[PDB]
């Protein structure tokens with residue numbers, strides 16, 4: 001089950017402005033982005049703020065700590081730059097930023113690169129120099145997904161951008177997956193064998209359609225660290241998500257649970273030990289105009 005364990009809000013603020021979350025490499029600590037562009041560190045059990053940093057002059061939309069604890073990616077709403085890389089050892093400082101990329105992720109196997117998304121276009125950057133290594137855009141193969149988000153595969157040799165599979169080393173598009181929806185561009189399963197693009201599960205080897213999973217329609221997904229469970233939440237047609245998230249067995253795509261929290265969801269994350277789930281939820285009735293979010297901690 002998902003037993004509520006604890007809840008907290010942005011300390012001392014009339015209106016709590018948490019917008020996104022990620023567990024730190026440091027156990028017992030959660031990182032939260034806010035609607036004023038700050039990064040907060042919270043002790044996740046006491047619900048007490050420990051540190052605060054200034055990152056952007058607009059709402060943080062998403063963040064991602066590096067596994068080793070040394071680096072953090074942030075993205076914002078209206079800032080220039082829209083995304084940035086921060087060092088977290090000794091002094092919290094901006095290392096590099098990514099002009100107009102509104103989404104960024106680390107590479108997966110070795111976290112030496114950043115992949116940023118601007119619309120239908122992917123940009124790959126070197127973490128050391130900040131230099132743009134690659135622009136990935138193929139006018140013949142584009143799907144023009146409205147919520148595109150480029151991503152590396154588990155071994156970093158492939159990228160999926162706009163439903164197109166790229167060989168990174170050669171910088172060539174090797175396959176376009178056919179379009180079935182307007183918005184969602186897809187992710188790699190952690191198993192290395194499958195691509196999940198909205199409701200379609202494709203085999204990487206053959207490019208054959210393996211499964212259709214209707215419940216994944218319009219969902220962002222994240223897997224637990226062991227890659228046994230997949231969490232999905234449907235984007236809203238303001239909070240990025242509706243009031244529900246769903247779990248699925250990552251091995252067979254069979255559903256496990258649907259959780260309706262009856263509040264708009266902003267973000268969800270799990271810890272490295274897959275002990276806990278943190279969900280950012282707006283308080284009030286559904287689609288409240290008032291912004292007053294909490295972070296709920298659930299025991300998986």
Ligand SMILES: NC(=O)C[C@H](NC(=O)c1c[nH]c(-c2cnn(CCN3CCOCC3)c2)c1-c1ccc(Cl)cc1F)c1ccc(F)c(Cl)c1
Pocket residue numbers: 020021061062063076077078102103147148149220221222231232233240241245246265266267268269
């Ligand atoms: N942290 C994670 O990776 C877990 C993952 N969260 C998200 O994907 C987001 C959280 N806020 C967002 C978010 C908030 N605002 N925006 C839009 C920001 N604009 C983009 C265009 O330029 C202006 C700013 C995305 C997104 C988001 C939405 C869509 C796209 Cl394509 C890309 C994303 F990162 C998630 C997975 C499964 C779940 F069940 C739930 Cl509830 C959440």
